[PDB]
Design a binder for this molecule. Structure first.
Ligand SMILES: CC[C@H]1OC(=O)[C@H](C)[C@@H](O[C@H]2C[C@@](C)(OC)[C@@H](O)[C@H](C)O2)[C@H](C)[C@@H](O[C@@H]2O[C@H](C)C[C@H](N(C)C)[C@H]2O)[C@](C)(O)C[C@@H](C)C(=O)[C@H](C)[C@@H](O)[C@]1(C)O
Length: 391
């Protein structure tokens, strides 16, 4: 059990690192020091009316409560929209359960049910943290807390209102209806705490990472990379930071996509500067590269820039397209974390239209390395990514 003990030690070191980052770049003080201030700056009358909301949430939900939630979101005659309903959950959600059933039209549908006391527990949890943001802003000198409230409010309701996630899925269901390579389940019914979609199943990407075949890894890895670039060009949207649980390989060779609670807006499609930057980076055209990256916002305006660092900055994007079929390995990813610079020209505040895809691409690239997949990324880039193909 000793490797999973490393996993817990790895998660704990990673989570405390982000706490330190939060202290230095956010609250401008330690978590211990801040907790002291918040204890006094926040009344005890607000301390526990919050407490009671969290106790309502034994681990799997009893069937009587599943009906109860269904009695609310779908109503009195919710069993008349189903042909049958399995009271035993097939999976677990973040704050709910997933039930397999049969719709009235004969289709197999997957039904997600949110726990009864999760709405109050999370909304209260929002107000408390929102209250703490006020404390830091008013009492902690030199604290950066912009948009932190906006972030938390958006995250919360995306978790509490299933209609928002379902709306995103309906968007991908139309653009990728009848598609040769991608299958997105249609949304049958949507409610604040109940969402119903078509049932699909295959080989989970997680199962492929563990002990999948070489061909399985390459295939679903190629499809994942294609989805990253095709979605913004076709749908004006980008599927957010991807977790292996969101994807599966269908028997016919297609990739299944089941989660859309992370969709980010890309109205004007994929930016032209990104593909153009990588193109100039590969051809070593530093003469046209640096002014381009400056205009785009990859590097800071009016600052001395090292070519040596530019190469480190883009090599995770350039090296894959320097061949026809790149082999995304973990060993390669380890080499990317090695700097020839020994103790900043980067832009630590990228514009939104560049920040969104680059984060997604980075997360996708990490998954491809866990897959040990062979991906024709060079071809995909020429076809889908604007500016990358030579004019
Ligand atoms: C892709 C990578 C991730 O998105 C980002 O990091 C970009 C950089 C933010 O935009 C940035 C940049 C910008 C300008 O939004 C475009 C800004 O308004 C917000 C606060 O932060 C996003 C998308 C924000 O959304 C936006 O939040 C707004 C409050 C409302 C907006 N909506 C009306 C469209 C909504 O899309 C927000 C809060 O992170 C969404 C929450 C739910 C997430 O955690 C989502 C699911 C992320 O995992 C993500 C989408 O993968």
């Amino acid at each position: 059990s000793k490797d999973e003990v490393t996993a817990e030690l790895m998660e704990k070191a990673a989570n405390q690192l982000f706490t330190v980052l939060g202290e230095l770049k956010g609250g401008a003080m330690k978590v211990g020091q801040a907790l002291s201030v918040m204890e006094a700056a926040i009344p005890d009358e607000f301390g526990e009316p919050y407490r009671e909301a969290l106790t309502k949430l034994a681990p799997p939900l009893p069937a009587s409560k599943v009906h109860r939630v269904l009695d609310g979101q779908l109503g009195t005659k919710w069993r008349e929209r189903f042909s049958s309903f399995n009271d035993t959950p097939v999976a677990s959600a973040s704050i709910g359960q997933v039930h397999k059933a049969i719709w009235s039209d004969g289709r197999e549908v997957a039904v997600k049910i949110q726990y009864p006391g999760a709405d109050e527990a999370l909304r209260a949890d929002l107000k408390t943290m929102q209250r703490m943001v006020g404390v830091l802003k008013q009492l902690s000198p030199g604290a950066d807390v912009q948009g932190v409230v906006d972030e938390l409010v958006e995250r919360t309701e995306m978790e509490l209102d299933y209609r928002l996630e379902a709306a995103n899925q309906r968007a991908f269901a139309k653009a990728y209806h009848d598609h040769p390579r991608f299958q997105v389940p249609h949304v049958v019914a949507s409610a604040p705490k109940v969402v119903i979609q078509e049932w699909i199943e295959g080989v989970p990407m997680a199962e492929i990472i563990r002990h999948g075949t070489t061909e399985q890894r390459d295939l679903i890895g190629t499809l994942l990379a294609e989805l990253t670039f095709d979605a913004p060009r076709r749908l004006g949207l980008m599927h957010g930071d991807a977790h292996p649980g969101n994807f599966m390989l269908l028997p016919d060779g297609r990739m299944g996509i089941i989660d859309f609670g992370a969709v980010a807006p890309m109205p004007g499609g994929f930016p032209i500067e990104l593909g153009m930057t990588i193109r100039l980076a590969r051809e070593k055209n530093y003469d046209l590269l640096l002014p381009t990256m400056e205009k785009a916002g990859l590097i800071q305006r009016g600052r001395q820039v090292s070519v040596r660092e530019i190469d480190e900055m883009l090599r995770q994007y350039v090296e894959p397209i320097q061949v026809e079929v790149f082999h995304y390995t973990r060993k390669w990813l380890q080499k990317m974390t090695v700097s020839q610079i020994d103790r900043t020209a980067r832009q630590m505040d990228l514009p939104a239209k560049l920040a969104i895809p680059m984060r997604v691409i980075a997360s996708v690239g990490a998954i491809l390395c866990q897959l040990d997949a062979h991906v024709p990324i060079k071809a995909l880039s020429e076809e889908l990514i604007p500016g990358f193909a030579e004019p």
